[model samples]
Target: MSGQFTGTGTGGDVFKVDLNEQFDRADMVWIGTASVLVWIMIPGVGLLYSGISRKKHALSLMWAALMAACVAAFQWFWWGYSLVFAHNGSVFLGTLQNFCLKDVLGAPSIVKTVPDILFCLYQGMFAAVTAILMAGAGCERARLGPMMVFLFIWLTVVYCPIAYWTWGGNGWLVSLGALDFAGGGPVHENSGFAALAYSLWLGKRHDPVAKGKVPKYKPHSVSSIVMGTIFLWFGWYGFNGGSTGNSSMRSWYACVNTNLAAATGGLTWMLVDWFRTGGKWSTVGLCMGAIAGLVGITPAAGYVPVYTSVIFGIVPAIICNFAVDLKDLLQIDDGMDVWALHCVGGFVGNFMTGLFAADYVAMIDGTEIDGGWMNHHWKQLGYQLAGSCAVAAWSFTVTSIILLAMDRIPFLRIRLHEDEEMLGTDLAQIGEYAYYADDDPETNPYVLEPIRSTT
Candidate 1:
């Protein structure tokens, strides 16, 4: 974990730099690595949304995702980072100590040698991704303008507060000793809950199948969804591995486990589909499984052993497969499987972390310790369970409240007219094309033909 230390100590001096400077140096290196990771969540999102949308709506969906980053980048610089990570003064929230990143110069960073700006920007990516991640669940059905509104409000409220709880210096969750290291609570849980809330606000898509009418709940482009899945699969390496903050054995382990989990999840889903549907291989099933594995391992990646990922891989598929049906039974039109993957996956991973914390089971000294089932310590599991459910119920409630407040505004209910949605949004929202209709007959290029006939 050591890095290129730059400081030179004098033989005799009244002032000393610091002993942990080496650790700080290493920490900064990790942060820098994370910062440059090119988290495909950015464009992975673009591809994901673009793929699912119809030719007319694909471009706009991608734009909606980019717009989230555009909006969040500005918002974070202004106050988003301050709200989440500033030193605590209030009981439930943080002070404006970092407002506009003021006085951040020479501030002690989350990682040594790295500027506080690095931490802020890295966290900012999480906020931006969270905003767009929900857009996927609400895609096709939600309007761009309205989606922005929800992103702005939801990130500030749901995301910011949840972040303070887990990572903030004075937050209660951190005090309870829940180790997110990344953002299982603030990012995954919040995105899952907020997305479901926003979907409820928009109401259900006018699915032809749902209404027993002629229209079907066909995805605008199935291939687009597959491509989006690929983009996400690629970006997730950085998303999880980069969170390790050091290029050490732990970091290497995390990357390998993440890869294993993804592969296992994809295979597990394909096999399940093969058996369930009379030997059919579903593209969407494979994609969903890959993501399910990724989501499941996210919380446990750093600490859990590599072999555990295989089991974690299958867990999400079984849960998500059931979650699909349960969601339909409960009738919450979360649209996509955001709730299924994030909420359910977070739940399973967090619970397992307590069981597999490892050290508590094996004795620190020569003497054996009792912290897990093998060691007969069950209390840890209770804490994990409570933390997960508490986050879920609280996030859902707070998100609903925020939407309700936004709803009161005269212009905030930004759902599109029924006719506008029927025509498709790419053309209506941005005058763009998801794919051209002519050059590639396979997809609508949306090209205008020449005025004269060539014949």
Candidate 2:
């Protein structure tokens, strides 16, 4: 394990360092694989959003989701990692010591069971996915180029700081005894509220709806929604299990909790929708419910007992199902229901973590915590509230400012032109179509003739 040092620091330093020797190989392997699993969820978000959108604008959403991942990966490599994980950095942000990943080599990461480089890769997926989720609010109507710019800035200003506060060694939330097993606050809540801001700023889509009535539209593809939900559920095993940073019993326990919650959430949502729709079983409602459960259990997966996770799944599904009405009440056109499912579910998860977190479960991974109300820690609820509210407020405010500033710039106008809206984003912005229905004149009676020559 010894060699000559060639990277950015003192030339005379030996590369034979054994900082990662104490780490477990199984932990490293699991986290590395988990990183890939989380990465898969980015496209899952795209598929889900695309399926839920109007057919004409479907491809643009898929494009935004993938592009967000790319932008986030580059940003993380450049400075996002440094700004969140720099050792001995400030409570609000990390330093630039690891800029461009200069020294992120074989050193042991904060988890103490994996290398820093692997940790960086895994965390980069989180940053990417969060940005992707937030971008859903602007689906169908927002300009792609401007949205990408907004994502880059949003990652720097909103995501990195909140992630630092939740997980950084010296972050204020960490010091104040707030608990977040994975990223319910930083990822779900942050993205969800940011989505609300973006939707508000972008205004409603051009769909015609009568006043005093909410706009209702059916998904163009139920199959895509099911497939996307499957991807998200598959990736969530890594999202929750990998947070343990090891293949210990706690990791397995987290996986179990994740599955149970998703199941309960899905069933609960299906039932609720069935009752509301007068005995109609809605496939889309089932998928949305499962996602709600997954989002709800994220923060509590590693700390709460198995039984409480069922409650986590059931509660969030019901609450989020009802919260969908808030969009119409507020007159905000959140096309993807990001606020209801992610933001509200995230807050419920964080708050409930304060009630159900168990000391023994936390110690299963060898970390000590005061536990929550179940362990007589009365003040844990206040801490959770403080962290959740701080992240929500910061994300919403900063996101609004970013969108407003971008909209004012002539070239960076955030919304599509009126003509583009009439034409659909796939055809207007990307010059492509998800479905060429011109061949089926019966189904698409008014299909426009092909403008481009195929021969």
Candidate 3:
């Protein structure tokens, strides 16, 4: 089939027709397709978390990560989407008028290049994956029930508001001219700080620290880490480029910057870890660096020049490395360093955007903006900082409250019991192991002999 639809040689046809005045067919299709690409990050997150955890709890973590999207769909379809995107009387939160997606379908947003329905679905994916990332803080120790409940509530209380503030046209931050090309504040910063709150509430795992203060945890599979990193990097193209909201030259530019920034971040982190590890190469460090780069450029991707993209990658890698140190120093129990890589990286990205954004680039969409410091718009920095601070404070505070409230409910207690945690959530919660290593005598169990001829 020739994938391109052909016209009936008329203005109106089944295969080809007049495009909507406010929307471009290509841009609409692109944003919709990009949503599919973004969905890969859900499984990507599962693989990443499963690899970082012990085998016993691997499947449990993967299940939770995958289910985040499922739960978010219900929440968003009911009210989450409306709360974030629909018109509202208040500056902070959206009204309930659009709950259940009332009046949301078929309508086209005047500003975006798609129907309101497509916009809703696309933005919904962003919301879903972000909730999954926030769950990264609790990791292996969080119970499925409580985590699921918290995922639902937290998306409403923490994610929706910050998203509205940063991206919603009527939001106060938008009014202040805060520049978040995609979701530095709403996704990364919100998830990062929420992760901080989550890890704090769960406390440290008993074995995560041992004699000499060494961390007890190690990747269950380096291969999984590599695979997960590849998925994230691939999905990130859609993550950053799709933010352009249209099929334009700016999308290509964003993709170019995203790649260069990631490369810089990877090399910068590899070299830093080499110096620290006495010349040993680390795959984990490289992966973390790549993620850090992606996080750093998220907010500035569309607004900055390509040359300055290197700063976005390099600075965040350094900050994230330092953030790794802060986790232990501050006595926090971040099992996977979610807060450091996402929260700190997002903060640095947003703040730097004020310094790096270019007027020429910002106006590429045919809209006039003051741009960043490159345009001598020094006040942009203040706005950027203010926006980041607002998101951090809101995410942390509301997340802490939701978790605390959930803890009080007997059915929705957040942390798993000690014995359950010790046994690992895979067997304790799910009643199964992630893998049957005993399937082969060459591995665990070591039952020498013919091993019953493979049962």
Candidate 4:
């Protein structure tokens, strides 16, 4: 639904082709765009987290990102896809009906009438990106070896089941009409809860100096964050709009609305930061704000009218900021704020959609949604609230159970020791330099010194 950001005929009733048409070559092109945008979240997450951590861990964060990409490439092709969107197999999971995407070639896409090849590739991108989010939550102190293994198991167990429950036909929530249009519940909320769980398991970072470790706490490069954010913003076009699959005015409207929401989110958050921090312009703040807007609007992008995108931006922008503070207060050691941005933003999106979604079939083409401020159908809000809670509880409870089971393996510890955190993960884990200048004590002018300055 990323294309929904473009602001076209979001809920317009009229269309050219039948809702369930056959796949064509052009549809493949649209799916290609969606696939591209979905992959963007991988490096987008890498660079975003890379910039947020110790300078010494920059390369380490990059490594984790690439690790997610690699693992996703393997897992999604093998059993991951089947575990998720295959046909209805059971109450919780999908069947092995499309293992390795077998026999899915000519079938209609979940949204568009495209070749199943294109859809598989697009969904594969989502799997890869979600795996990357797991890295973001666990990056700072988790040992890389065990974390990689965790990715394999977590995708198989946690991510797949939740994805099925929400999006796949057999999914209970989907069958019950949960409008998670673009992964607000499955991707953002699910990953956010993962961050919380990881935090509970891994203690906060120890003071880097006392321990014998080369601790470096600075962003490797601001340019990298900025560049990665641009790519994310661009790719979102396909992620949302292409999900519509129809080459019509509706897709165009969705795209514009998505973009508008992003702009407003950036503006609103930066403005708040200006007021709070005396006009400090933070690249991080701007980027996160834009993402908040995109996430906040995701669930409603297809179901709602255009004007609601403003609230989508502003409401979540503020809520995410507060969620960040709450997480800090809770003392959860999520390394890169996944819970705040995605979890909080996702909650806002899913809940608000109940108030803004346009149901054209009900003869209300452009009216406020069921539980809108005007309509007062709070029950709609309740349904959305239940849906969001179900997503979090189901994902978190199952993931924790999976971890408890995996912990029995003698070599399967999930966290790194304090020594590893102080030494900087790149040197401690991968033996590389995120910033080459930090390693050269003689010529390096920007080295961080932790020596106690006693009088």
Candidate 4, lDDT over the whole model: 0.67
TM-score of each: 0.79, 0.88, 0.86, 0.80
Worst 10 residues of 1 by lDDT: 446-455
lDDT of 4 by residue, 400-451 (tens): 7755665555356565344433443243343333443355333544332221
In Å, residue 310's CA in model 1 sits off its true spot by: 1.4
Question: Predictions ranked by lDDT, top down?
Answer: 2, 3, 4, 1
The sequence of per-residue lDDT tens digits that candidate 3 reaches over residues 1-455 is: 33232221111222443325445789888888888878787767766766654333422445566788899888999989888877552678777767888766444542457666777878888898787787766654466667778888899889999988877758899899989998889999889988888777765644344224764235666777777778788888888888888888888889899998898998888878888878977677787888889999999999999999999889999888778766556555454377888899999999999999998996777646798889999999999999988998899899888878877775687764554333322332333343343432224342111111111
Off by over 4 Å in 3: 1-21, 54-59, 205-207, 210-217, 417-455
The reply for model 1, stretches above 4 Å from the true place, is: 1-26, 49-59, 89-91, 110-114, 209-218, 330-334, 360-376, 416-455
Q: How many clashes would you count in candidate 2?
A: 1
The lDDT leader among the candidates is: 2
Candidate 1 lDDT score at position 316:
78
Q: Please tell me which model should have the higher TM-score, number 2 or number 3.
A: 2
Colliding residue pairs in candidate 1: 51-224, 56-426, 208-215, 436-444, 436-445, 436-446, 437-444, 437-445, 437-446
lDDT winner, 1 or 4 = 4
